[PDB]
Design an enzyme around this catalytic site. Structure first.
Site, PDB file in Angstrom:
ATOM      1  N   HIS A 200       0.805  -1.225   0.000  1.00  0.00           N
ATOM      2  CA  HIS A 200       0.000   0.000   0.000  1.00  0.00           C
ATOM      3  C   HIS A 200       0.844   1.284   0.000  1.00  0.00           C
ATOM      4  O   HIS A 200       0.273   2.383  -0.056  1.00  0.00           O
ATOM      5  CB  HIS A 200      -1.048  -0.012   1.122  1.00  0.00           C
ATOM      6  CG  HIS A 200      -0.538   0.180   2.513  1.00  0.00           C
ATOM      7  ND1 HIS A 200       0.069   1.325   2.980  1.00  0.00           N
ATOM      8  CD2 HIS A 200      -0.566  -0.715   3.539  1.00  0.00           C
ATOM      9  CE1 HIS A 200       0.397   1.137   4.258  1.00  0.00           C
ATOM     10  NE2 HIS A 200       0.019  -0.126   4.616  1.00  0.00           N
TER      11      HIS A 200
ATOM     12  N   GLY B 160       2.809   6.175   9.747  1.00  0.00           N
ATOM     13  CA  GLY B 160       4.151   5.990   9.225  1.00  0.00           C
ATOM     14  C   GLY B 160       4.822   4.699   9.699  1.00  0.00           C
ATOM     15  O   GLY B 160       5.896   4.396   9.210  1.00  0.00           O
TER      16      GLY B 160
ATOM     17  N   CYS C  54       3.905   1.614   9.194  1.00  0.00           N
ATOM     18  CA  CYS C  54       3.747   0.452   8.329  1.00  0.00           C
ATOM     19  C   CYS C  54       5.094   0.039   7.733  1.00  0.00           C
ATOM     20  O   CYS C  54       5.954   0.873   7.449  1.00  0.00           O
ATOM     21  CB  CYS C  54       2.738   0.660   7.221  1.00  0.00           C
ATOM     22  SG  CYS C  54       1.086   1.032   7.882  1.00  0.00           S
TER      23      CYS C  54
END
Lengths: 305, 305
Positions: A41, A143, A145
């Site tokens: 993503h 942030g 991820c």
């Protein structure tokens, strides 16, 4: 003595963390040999995340659209591909700090350390359990991820988790390093049900053994039970059923303490039925389920890496 | 979101840990530049520890009695000297992995990460508070002495603790890196009283703010209180008195949440007087005091190193 929720030393993993940017979106990646692994993503806008067609979104991207920075070193991307929910960015340099490693898919109830990172930079380390419902209760801001979870055995890092999302309920979901989600979750901003969670019974028993070893023994009682009888109670209290495999895993702790596993089950049964009466065990006022049998042994025997 | 007891990434410290042997005793040392720092009690036998004359014992030791190993590489001690309760072993090589560092003496109530080590090898990492009575509630088996505690700010490791002793009561005592004990403790195997401990009030309030930020607000009330009134209750419950300095440190959390500090004190007062009534806050059934105001801000704002 003493007993603490202890993470693995994070140094081997810190050396693998990188920043990955694609357009507006920055998150973390994992650089092993000449591949960087990150959540797919990264290619999405905020709007895309509501209903992304990842195959179509990725087709619009080229190698030079992925900005990968390892500290202040810019890596050159020479290939990209998607495996399940992770992106693999081939770079022209092998990570000189690559540790010995494995990718493992862990079982519900197993524990691991998370290195929380922002912009490719480590923030902190903590121990997590994979819940029976395949969520984790972590600490992850915007942030985070691409932050990973891992275990270390001797010199070998077993990576088991990459962080992808926060569900509307505030718990966390992610993938193994082959990009397959734990649980029924998808990488889309949608309401997603996690199953009923349950308490990890074998871990609670391990922690009760840890308590005895440390001299906290008020909860030991004069009763015993059977697996079937215990499990009737476990089911009522949304505890995982105990199996002979679990009893077997607890054998070394049973041996050390001289407390038969079914005797400790009878102690747990009384705690479930009667509560803790405002008392504590190992500094906790609830029954703790985030220590595995191996965790307890490790801590009680001083295993190093 | 989510809130966890999070340690600093340990990589910069892992690269400084070594094994120090003197005769029968092995423990850990910290290798910075061309000096290795370790507990001076490495020079003691089991019998010596009952009543050591360290000056006399050190005189009988030679450089070649100190075996210092960094992984599999033997370092070569070219000098030894004692500073308070720490030994400084001068070695012929500067540690190439020496981070930017400071030695700091921390205040009671402040927090730090411990890298628990055995035989010079890192085992695990966890966050600790220095208790008001200058003990720590750690996890340390035989051989953990010389393990250190630290904070990181940006690129700089501030070492604040070296582990020396387990008291007969099972809590832990140690020194700053200039070898001065925290608290009344001495490096002798003798019964030693620790102060009455108290709860770190400012830290409990910080954690209540963390709870609100993370969406746990049941304990909020519209009652008010004064500092003097609050402190009458704190004293009854063996909480540290709250000062204006503490109120000032909580200011940024007050601003973020719109909850005046004395309003949060009134909430805490109700929790102390009435208990938690079987409810939890941030997954805990007790009031947690091992998170400082700065810890909460750090974690809620995603500071990296």
């Amino acid at each position: 003595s003493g007993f603490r929720k202890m993470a693995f030393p994070s140094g081997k993993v810190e050396g693998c963390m990188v920043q990955v940017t694609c357009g507006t979106t920055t998150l973390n990646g994992l650089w092993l040999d000449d591949v960087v692994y990150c959540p797919r993503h990264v290619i999405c806008t905020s709007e895309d995340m509501l209903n992304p067609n990842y195959e179509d979104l990725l087709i619009r991207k080229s190698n030079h659209n992925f900005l990968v920075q390892a500290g202040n070193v810019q890596l050159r991307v020479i290939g990209h591909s998607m495996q399940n929910c992770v992106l693999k960015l081939k770079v022209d340099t092998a990570n000189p700090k690559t540790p010995k490693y494995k990718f493992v898919r862990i079982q519900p109830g197993q524990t691991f350390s998370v290195l929380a990172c922002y912009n490719g930079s480590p923030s902190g380390v903590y121990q997590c359990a994979m819940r029976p419902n395949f969520t984790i209760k972590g600490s992850f801001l915007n942030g985070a991820c691409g932050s990973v979870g891992f275990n270390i055995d001797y010199d070998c890092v077993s990576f088991c988790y990459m962080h992808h999302m926060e569900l509307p309920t505030g718990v966390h979901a992610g993938t193994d390093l082959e990009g397959n989600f734990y649980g029924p979750f998808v990488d889309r901003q949608t309401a997603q049900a996690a199953g009923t969670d349950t308490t990890i019974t074998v871990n609670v028993l391990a922690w009760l053994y840890a308590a005895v070893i440390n001299g906290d023994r008020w909860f030991l009682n004069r009763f015993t039970t059977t697996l079937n009888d215990f499990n009737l109670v476990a089911m009522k209290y949304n505890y995982e059923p105990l199996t002979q495999d679990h009893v077997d895993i607890l054998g070394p702790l049973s041996a050390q303490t001289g407390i038969a596993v079914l005797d400790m089950c009878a102690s747990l049964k009384e705690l479930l039925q009667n509560g803790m009466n405002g008392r504590t065990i190992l500094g906790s006022a609830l029954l703790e389920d985030e220590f595995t049998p191996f965790d307890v042994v490790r801590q009680c025997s001083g295993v190093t890496f």
